[PDB]
Amino acid sequence: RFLKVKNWETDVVLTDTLHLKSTLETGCTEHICMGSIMLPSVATKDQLFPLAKEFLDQYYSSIKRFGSKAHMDRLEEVNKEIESTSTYQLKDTELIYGAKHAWRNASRCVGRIQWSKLQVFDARDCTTAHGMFNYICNHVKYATNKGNLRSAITIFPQRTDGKHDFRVWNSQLIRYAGYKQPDGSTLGDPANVQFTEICIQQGWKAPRGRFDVLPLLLQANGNDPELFQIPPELVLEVPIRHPKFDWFKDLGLKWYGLPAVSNMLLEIGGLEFSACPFSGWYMGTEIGVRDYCDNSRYNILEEVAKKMDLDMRKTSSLWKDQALVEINIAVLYSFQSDKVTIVDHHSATESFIKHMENEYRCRGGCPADWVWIVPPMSGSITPVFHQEMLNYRLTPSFEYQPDPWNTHVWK
Numbered sequence: 001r002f003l004k005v006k007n008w009e010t011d012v013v014l015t016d017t018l019h020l021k022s023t024l025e026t027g028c029t030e031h032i033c034m035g036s037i038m039l040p041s042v043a044t045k046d047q048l049f050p051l052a053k054e055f056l057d058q059y060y061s062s063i064k065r066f067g068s069k070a071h072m073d074r075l076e077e078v079n080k081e082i083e084s085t086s087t088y089q090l091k092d093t094e095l096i097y098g099a100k101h102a103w104r105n106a107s108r109c110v111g112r113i114q115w116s117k118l119q120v121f122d123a124r125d126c127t128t129a130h131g132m133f134n135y136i137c138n139h140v141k142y143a144t145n146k147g148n149l150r151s152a153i154t155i156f157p158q159r160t161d162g163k164h165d166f167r168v169w170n171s172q173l174i175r176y177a178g179y180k181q182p183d184g185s186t187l188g189d190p191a192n193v194q195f196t197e198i199c200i201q202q203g204w205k206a207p208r209g210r211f212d213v214l215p216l217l218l219q220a221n222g223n224d225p226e227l228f229q230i231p232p233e234l235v236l237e238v239p240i241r242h243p244k245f246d247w248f249k250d251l252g253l254k255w256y257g258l259p260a261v262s263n264m265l266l267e268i269g270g271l272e273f274s275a276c277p278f279s280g281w282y283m284g285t286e287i288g289v290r291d292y293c294d295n296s297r298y299n300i301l302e303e304v305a306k307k308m309d310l311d312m313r314k315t316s317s318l319w320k321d322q323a324l325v326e327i328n329i330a331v332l333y334s335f336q337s338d339k340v341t342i343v344d345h346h347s348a349t350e351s352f353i354k355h356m357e358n359e360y361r362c363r364g365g366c367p368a369d370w371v372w373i374v375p376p377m378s379g380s381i382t383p384v385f386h387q388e389m390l391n392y393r394l395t396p397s398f399e400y401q402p403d404p405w406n407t408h409v410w411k
């Protein structure tokens with residue numbers, strides 16, 4: 001019960017005691033492992049205090065004033081506020097620590113070497129969807145920083161009763177639209193075809209093309225959500241060119257610089273933040289491999305193989321692999337010749353091993369989801385493929401949450 005994780009590329013071995021602090025459950029039992037299930041699966045005051053205590057204990061431990069008077073009075077203070085309101089409010093400092101450690105514990109995140117460099121935007125004074133829009137806009141502009149991207153999170157008011165939730169209804173602040181066609185097929189992004197429809201049902205006017213930036217659907221205090229259009233000067237986009245093939249210009253592709261997940265739930269000391277968009281920068285593969293070449297996404301292996309003139313008759317010609325490697329050189333190249341922050345799957349996976357070492361040394365471990373950490377191309381030529389990882393669920397944490405349109409008691 002002081003487990004060992006080995007690397008088989010380097011024979012390096014690390015000891016994990018951090019998993020002992022784990023509290024939540026994984027999905028796995030002694031007789032079944034669910035490590036490749038994607039989504040494995042109101043709160044009272046009784047449950048609420050251990051979670052405040054637990055969180056408050058590590059936060060003061062982190063500023064190296066564990067259990068002091070300043071801690072015990074904060075423990076007493078929260079306890080009484082959970083008596084008084086059956087909930088409580090986080091200090092500015094507790095919110096930043098909590099948020100940063102949700103990221104630090106995001107076991108499916110490969111870019112976590114950066115977890116301490118996170119800009120926390122406190123939007124807990126927000127009351128309206130217009131305020132949400134305005135907080136998100138400052139987030140986008142700040143985190144984009146002219147392309148020298150910066151990690152940021154914007155934390156809207158915590159869930160209270162359940163019927164008054166702040167939700168960003170988009171899965172990401174910036175996504176391209178998804179239009180099915182009369183002839184069945186799909187323009188834009190097939191991922192978002194329902195969301196694109198919801199925006200239309202609430203009154204969007206779609207420029208029914210490809211890389212159409214969707215509008216924000218912001219629900220404030222449980223109210224029915226409202227559409228807002230991010231000023232296009234804030235939506236930084238990178239046109240994809242290849243450093244060889246000039247028909248790659250005519251491919252006519254671009255991606256947005258800012259990956260910013262808006263649909264997850266941030267958990268700090270038992271408090272539930274249902275609207276907490278967070279942003280970093282892209283590893284190339286999520287664009288080049290997944291976005292562009294997932295079969296039910298942009299599905300561009302067909303055309304990129306074409307304009308290379310490749311043996312598409314047969315499967316064993318690896319024409320798909322060949323076209324994938326070029327696509328990803330191009331995504332990278334475009335982003336870097338534009339000074340827009342991006343990381344290649346090699347650089348990022350090496351950093352994660354370096355980050356893993358730091359974690360096991362100064363923290364006793366690092367939760368990691370090998371299914372998610374290994375880049376979706378060239379697996380074994382990246383050092384994380386060869387790295388055993390213990391996955392376990394620490395807190396504070398980012399958590400999946402149901403889409404608001406399945407849950408929303410509407411009017």
Ligand code: HEM
Pocket residue numbers: 102103106108109110111112114118151152153264278279280281282283286343348372398
């Ligand atoms: C700064 C550069 C960052 C890089 C290079 C990076 C990299 C990645 C990648 C490649 C994924 C997999 C995405 C996918 O395949 O769908 C991911 C997932 C994730 N990352 Fe990061 N990320 C960064 C920033 C952040 C930040 C700022 C946070 C939180 C504040 C965060 C927390 C997460 C979460 C919650 C997930 C998804 C877990 C899930 O979907 O179940 N990351 N990251």
Ligand SMILES: Cc1cc(N)nc(-c2cc(CN(C)C)cc(F)c2F)c1
Pocket residue numbers: 172259260261278279280281282283286
């Ligand atoms: C902060 C950040 C950096 C980065 N490189 N990627 C992501 C990211 C994560 C998911 C995970 N789930 C919501 C499916 C989906 C995406 F499309 C992303 F872009 C987020």
Ligand SMILES: C[C@H](O)[C@H](O)[C@H]1CNc2nc(N)[nH]c(=O)c2N1
Pocket residue numbers: 035036037038371372373
């Ligand atoms: C079936 C499997 O769980 C699913 O494809 C997962 C696999 N690993 C992944 N890893 C990352 N980074 N992103 C993903 O979307 C997925 N999808």
Ligand SMILES: [Zn+2]
Pocket residue numbers: 028032033034035
């Ligand atoms: Zn398992």
